[PDB]
């Protein structure tokens, strides 16, 4: 249906941008996007900025003791 190649080209012509923006405009799951870019850069593209948003756990919000997080999204950026 939709592979990472999409955001790849978009960012290939744009540059510093976030994937969550596109996914949002299409109501596409955000938690997946995190893996979309992560998986894309997993090979060694350029740069990626992962960000999380929640409002339940007060202890785990900024600091990452484990790393895993429920529902997350990152951004794609080049040099």
From Swiss-Prot:
Gene3D superfamilies: Winged helix-like DNA-binding domain superfamily/Winged helix DNA-binding domain. One of its GO terms (molecular function) is iron-sulfur cluster binding. Iron-sulfur cluster binds at residues 56, 61, 64, 71. The keyword Glycoprotein does not apply. Signal peptide: none annotated. It comes from the Bacteria. Pfam families: FeoC (PF09012). Keywords: DNA-binding, Iron, Iron-sulfur, Metal-binding, Repressor, Transcription, Transcription regulation. Coiled coil: none annotated. Belongs to the FeoC family. NCBIfam families: PRK15431.1 (NF011960). This is Probable [Fe-S]-dependent transcriptional repressor.
């Amino acid at each position: 249906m939709a592979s990472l190649m999409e955001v790849r080209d978009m960012l290939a012509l744009q540059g510093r941008m976030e994937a969550k923006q596109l996914s949002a405009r299409l109501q596409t799951p955000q938690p997946l996007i995190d893996a979309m870019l992560e998986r894309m850069e997993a090979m060694g593209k350029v740069v990626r900025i992962s960000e999380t948003s929640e409002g339940c756990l007060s202890g785990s919000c900024k600091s990452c003791p484990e790393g895993k997080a429920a529902c997350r999204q990152e951004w794609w950026a080049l040099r």
